[PDB]
Each structure stands twice: as C-alpha cells, then as structure tokens.
Amino acid sequence: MIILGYNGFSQIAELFGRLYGYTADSVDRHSFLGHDAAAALFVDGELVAAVEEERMNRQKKTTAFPANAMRWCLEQAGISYEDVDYYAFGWNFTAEFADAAITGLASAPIPPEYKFQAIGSFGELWNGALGRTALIEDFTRHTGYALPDEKLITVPHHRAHLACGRTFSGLGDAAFLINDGQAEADSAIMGEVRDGKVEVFERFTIDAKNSLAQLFANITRYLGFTPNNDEYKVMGLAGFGKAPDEQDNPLLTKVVTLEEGGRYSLALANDPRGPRAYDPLFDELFDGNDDNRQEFDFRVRVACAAQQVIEAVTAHQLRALAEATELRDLIFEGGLALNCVNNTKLLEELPFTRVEVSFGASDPGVSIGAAAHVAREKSVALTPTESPYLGPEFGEDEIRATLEEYTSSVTWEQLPSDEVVGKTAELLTGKTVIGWFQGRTEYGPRALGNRSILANPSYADMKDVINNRVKHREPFRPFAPIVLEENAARVFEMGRKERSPYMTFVFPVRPEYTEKIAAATHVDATSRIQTVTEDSNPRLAALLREFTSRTDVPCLVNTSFNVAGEPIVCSPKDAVECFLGTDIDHLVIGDFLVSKR
Numbered sequence: 001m002i003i004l005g006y007n008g009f010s011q012i013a014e015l016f017g018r019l020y021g022y023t024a025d026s027v028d029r030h031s032f033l034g035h036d037a038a039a040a041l042f043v044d045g046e047l048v049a050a051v052e053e054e055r056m057n058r059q060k061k062t063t064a065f066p067a068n069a070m071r072w073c074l075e076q077a078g079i080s081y082e083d084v085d086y087y088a089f090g091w092n093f094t095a096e097f098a099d100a101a102i103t104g105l106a107s108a109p110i111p112p113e114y115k116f117q118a119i120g121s122f123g124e125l126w127n128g129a130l131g132r133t134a135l136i137e138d139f140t141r142h143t144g145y146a147l148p149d150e151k152l153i154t155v156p157h158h159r160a161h162l163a164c165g166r167t168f169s170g171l172g173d174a175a176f177l178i179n180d181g182q183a184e185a186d187s188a189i190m191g192e193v194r195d196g197k198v199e200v201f202e203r204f205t206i207d208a209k210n211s212l213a214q215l216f217a218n219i220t221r222y223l224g225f226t227p228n229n230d231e232y233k234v235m236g237l238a239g240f241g242k243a244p245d246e247q248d249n250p251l252l253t254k255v256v257t258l259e260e261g262g263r264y265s266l267a268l269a270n271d272p273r274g275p276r277a278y279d280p281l282f283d284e285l286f287d288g289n290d291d292n293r294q295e296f297d298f299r300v301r302v303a304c305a306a307q308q309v310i311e312a313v314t315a316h317q318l319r320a321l322a323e324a325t326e327l328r329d330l331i332f333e334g335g336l337a338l339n340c341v342n343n344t345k346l347l348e349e350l351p352f353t354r355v356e357v358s359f360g361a362s363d364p365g366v367s368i369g370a371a372a373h374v375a376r377e378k379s380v381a382l383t384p385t386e387s388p389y390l391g392p393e394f395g396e397d398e399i400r401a402t403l404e405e406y407t408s409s410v411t412w413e414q415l416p417s418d419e420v421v422g423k424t425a426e427l428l429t430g431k432t433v434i435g436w437f438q439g440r441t442e443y444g445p446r447a448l449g450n451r452s453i454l455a456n457p458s459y460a461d462m463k464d465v466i467n468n469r470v471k472h473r474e475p476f477r478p479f480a481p482i483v484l485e486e487n488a489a490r491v492f493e494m495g496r497k498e499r500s501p502y503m504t505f506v507f508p509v510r511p512e513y514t515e516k517i518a519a520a521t522h523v524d525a526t527s528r529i530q531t532v533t534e535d536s537n538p539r540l541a542a543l544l545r546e547f548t549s550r551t552d553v554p555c556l557v558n559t560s561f562n563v564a565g566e567p568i569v570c571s572p573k574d575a576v577e578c579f580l581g582t583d584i585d586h587l588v589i590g591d592f593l594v595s596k597r
C-alpha cells in the first residue's frame with residue numbers, strides 16, 4: 001500500500017490574476033487556494049518522504065503543481081508514479097459540492113447581475129483547476145503518468161488538516177478544532193475522534209463568508225502587510241500593546257457577533273464587494289487615514305484588537321466543544337493554529353489538559369493529511385511518528401562537490417563528524433551568527449534546526465547584530481529559541497506543556513533567564529520555543545550540551561535560514577548562495593565549516 005498526497009493547481013496562478021485581479025506582484029498574491037503546494041509519500045504506513053514545492057522551485061507558497069516534490073518523494077522511496085496505489089488531493093471539489101455551490105449562489109440576497117459574475121468565475125475555477133477533470137489533466141500534463149480515475153481520491157480540505165494533526169499528536173480519542181481561511185464550503189469545523197472514527201459536529205461548522213482566519217488576513221492587508229504571508233507581524237505587534245476591555249474592542253462589537261453553540265458571524269459577510277468591503281469599516285473604527293494606517297502606534301492598537309478577536313472567538317468555539325464532549329485531549333489544526341500566542345492561551349485558560357498543534361497546521365500540512373486520511377480509511381495501520389525532518393538529505397560527497405563550485409568565494413575544512421558540534425559551540429561562544437545545515441529538510445513554515453541560522457542570545461546587542469549580519473531579514477519578526485526538553489520548565493513558564501518541538505506554542509520567559517536568553521525573547525517576554533532531545537534531533541541536542549557547558553546559557557537563537565521573501569534553503573547550493581548574499585560569519589553544512597575569502 002503506497003499512497004501519495006499532494007496540493008497545487010498550475011492554472012490557479014493565472015485564473016485569480018485575471019478573475020479577481022490577485023496577481024504575482026499584488027499584496028493579494030498568496031490569498032487564493034493551492035498556496036503551499038507539496039507532496040508527501042506513505043509506503044506501507046511509514047511516512048517515508050515529504051517536501052513543499054516552495055523549497056524546490058524557490059518561489060514562496062508556490063500554488064504550482066508540486067512536480068519537483070513528487071519527483072523527489074518517489075526517488076527517495078525508489079519507485080515511479082505507476083507503483084502508487086492511490087493519489088490523495090487535499091481538496092474535495094466534487095460535482096455534489098459544485099451542485100450545492102451554484103444552488104447556494106442562486107439562493108442569496110443579491111442582485112442577479114452579481115450572481116452571473118460569481119457563478120461564471122466559479123465555472124472558470126471549476127473547469128480550469130478545481131474539478132476532478134482539470135485535476136487528472138493537470139497531473140497528466142506535469143508528471144507524464146496519466147492518472148486513472150480509480151487511483152485519485154480527493155480529501156475534504158478540513159479533513160486533510162485533521163489527518164495531519166492525528167499523525168503527529170501522539171493521542172488516541174481526542175476532540176478537535178479545524179479553523180482555516182477557507183475550505184470547499186466551510187471556514188472552520190469541530191468534532192471528535194473516537195476509537196479510530198472521526199465525527200464532525202456539524203452544529204459548529206462555520207461557513208466561508210463567516211471566516212475568522214480571513215478577518216485576521218484582511219487586518220494584515222489593512223496595515224500594509226501581505227495577507228496569507230505576514231499575519232505573524234500582527235501577532236508580533238500585539239506584543240507592544242495593552243489589550244482593550246472586550247466590551248471596548250471595536251472589532252468584537254461592530255464586526256464579529258458571538259452566537260450560541262460556539263458560533264459567530266461577520267458584518268459585511270454578504271457585501272458583494274467581497275472582503276475588501278472591510279477596509280473602510282476598519283477606518284470607521286480606528287481613526288484610519290493615509291498618514292496613520294501604516295504608522296506604528298496605529299498598527300499596535302489594531303493588532304491588539306485583531307489578536308483579542310482571535311483569542312475571544314476560538315475560546316468560545318472550544319468552550320462549546322467542552323460541553324459537546326467529555327474528552328480533554330485536543331487537536332487544533334488549520335491556519336489560525338499558526339497564532340502560537342493564542343495556542344498557549346487556549347491550553348492554559350480553557351479545560352483541555354493537552355492541546356497539539358503540528359508543524360503542518362497550515363495548508364503545507366494538507367498534502368501529508370490527504371494521504372494519511374486515505375490510508376487510515378484503507379485500514380492501513382499507520383506507524384506513529386513525531387518527525388518533521390522529511391525533506392532532502394545531502395551526503396558528505398554532494399556538499400564537498402558544491403563547495404568546490406565556490407572555491408573562488410569560500411574556504412572550508414571538513415571536521416571529524418562528532419567534533420563538529422563542539423567546534424560550532426566554540427564559535428557560538430562569541431558574537432557570531434551561524435548557518436546550520438544538517439539532516440533532512442524540515443517541513444512547514446518554521447525552521448526546526450536543520451536549515452537554521454544560530455546565534456548566542458546572552459549578549460544584549462545580539463538582536464541588532466543578527467538583523468545586521470543577515471541583512472535582508474524580514475522586519476516585525478521576533479527570534480525564537482531552541483532549548484533541551486529538560487531545561488524548558490526551568491527557563492520558560494510551561495504550565496500544562498512538558499515539550500514544544502515545533503515552535504507552535506509561545507511561553508513566558510522566567511525572570512531568572514531574561515538577561516541570558518534576551519535575543520530569543522519578544523517584548524511580550526515571550527519565546528516561540530523548540531524543545532530538543534537526542535531522539536528528535538541528535539545533532540541539535542548535542543550542539544546545545546556543548547554550547548551550554550561552555551557559556552552556562554540554555555538556549556540558542558534559531559531563525560529560518562533564508563533572505564527576505566525567499567523560502568527556507570533546501571539544497572546546499574541554496575545554503576552557500578544565501579551565506580554569500582548575507583554578512584553571516586560562518587556556515588556549518590554537515591561535517592563542513594565554511595568561511596568567506
């Protein structure tokens with residue numbers, strides 16, 4: 001039983017650019033489905049391989065067919081397209097949905113002129129990208145394998161999110177919340193998993209016009225940031241501000257309405273100007289004009305408001321789900337689980353003992369999920385696994401061959417394998433920013449110490465220094481720390497958590513370490529931490545013991561290894577080209593210590 005799950009449409013790029021004006025140069029360029037195209041391959045229940053097409057084609061959140069990733073996934077498992085039993089697509093645009101979607105459109109309080117325009121666009125998206133026919137054509141043009149209808153199973157988007165979380169959570173019977181920007185028809189659902197069987201409580205299912213995630217997205221656009229690429233900047237800005245009273249939160253009274261059964265709805269959900277309608281309504285709530293919106297204290301006030309909406313709405317949803325079932329082990333998946341601040345708050349302030357958000361809570365995870373969903377259904381007992389390190393590895397010979405292609409630009413020494421960790425630790429004792437390239441490429445949006453820039457957080461000026469050594473760093477972004485699992489409770493206020501290996505939860509820094517791990521903390525006194533063990537990342541675990549024995553510092557800064565708007569480096573080619581395009585001191589890539597000439 002070989003099952004491959006994927007996500008992408010080659011024509012989705014073209015169609016949104018034309019129909020909705022969402023073009024490659026627009027701030028709305030990441031705001032259409034198919035973003036975070038990828039492949040994930042299960043052989044006999046072991047998740048053998050996975051990587052996002054953004055890492056291969058080097059184009060961020062690429063909506064493309066994941067051709068290079070599917071190539072690589074098959075190569076890793078040493079098979080071809082024809083050995084795969086079922087392909088899993090992480091969207092389920094069936095005829096039944098399209099039947100309901102038109103029927104829905106027909107039945108709506110709208111001038112029929114807007115109705116023709118909408119139904120016709122949905123047609124262009126249907127025929128162009130979404131439909132089972134477009135899919136089979138799209139696959140067949142790109143792989144060269146002609147995909148038998150038999151071998152293609154489309155998974156409901158939200159169900160694909162669910163399948164990702166279950167694969168990595170460790171749990172059995174669990175409650176769950178999926179809350180993403182938009183699915184086929186829903187924007188969020190809740191239910192439970194009991195003794196293998198998923199059950200959606202349809203009573204909580206929120207429609208796509210009442211989208212909590214896309215409200216935050218509109219807010220991100222409002223403040224001159226890229227919606228669907230820069231929402232953390234809002235979360236980030238909520239750090240420098242005080243939350244209003246919930247009765248004093250303009251967005252929580254004139255935009256969002258809390259309904260019984262943990263439901264909610266939005267003013268201007270049915271306005272046929274689309275979502276851009278909220279732009280002037282936001283000016284009418286926050287003094288907004290053309291010399292105040294992209295300002296700081298403005299950005300901060302809004303941010304706090306938006307962040308509180310997020311905290312407020314999701315809190316309601318989960319309260320409801322509390323009575324709806326007995327279970328207190330929660331799976332939170334979908335893109336609103338990217339709000340790591342909010343994730344901690346749900347855990348601590350609500351009745352769920354355990355809350356598991358995976359490194360694939362976002363759409364990148366729906367490629368893994370799509371495959372997992374089909375497998376479990378095929379009674380294929382799934383080998384439990386916690387590892388995000390699912391992408392391309394590189395040998396000692398492939399790195400040495402790449403560094404020789406750059407003899408003119410960099411020098412390098414090849415250290416003995418088990419001395420590297422200790423030599424990098426000695427460097428890291430200084431005001432030194434490091435490139436760290438080891439093991440298989442990590443999956444999802446956060447770098448978890450295989451394609452990382454590392455640095456010593458103990459020096460007070462290190463924040464300013466990292467941002468200066470790696471020019472081309474994207475602003476409004478705080479630095480996150482790595483720590484060994486054992487030092488987590490000592491250094492951070494963990495509450496109900498004993499470990500956070502994916503940077504999915506934020507935690508307050510205890511006062512006795514605030515000067516020691518400064519660079520890896522926000523002004524909120526918060527760190528989006530990655531716990532590390534000899535089991536999860538032995539080389540990374542080892543680095544920390546060497547670094548900590550020398551400095552008595554328990555944490556290293558771990559920030560994504562990339563320039564602005566470029567995705568995380570995948571190849572060693574990628575790593576060196578980045579190292580040279582930055583003022584980073586050194587690059588430790590496998591057993592090699594690269595320096596510049």
Ligand SMILES: NC(=O)OP(=O)(O)OC[C@H]1O[C@@H](n2cnc3c(N)ncnc32)[C@H](O)[C@@H]1O
Pocket residue numbers: 033179180181182183213214216217227228229231232235310334335336338339340361362363364
């Ligand atoms: N399925 C689909 O359409 O893609 P998806 O599941 O990846 O959507 C993620 C959604 O979460 C929003 N989002 C991203 N980061 C966020 C954060 N920190 N807080 C709140 N919303 C966030 C983001 O703007 C987007 O609306």
Ligand SMILES: [Mg+2]
Pocket residue numbers: 157161180181182334335362363366
């Ligand atoms: Mg999604």
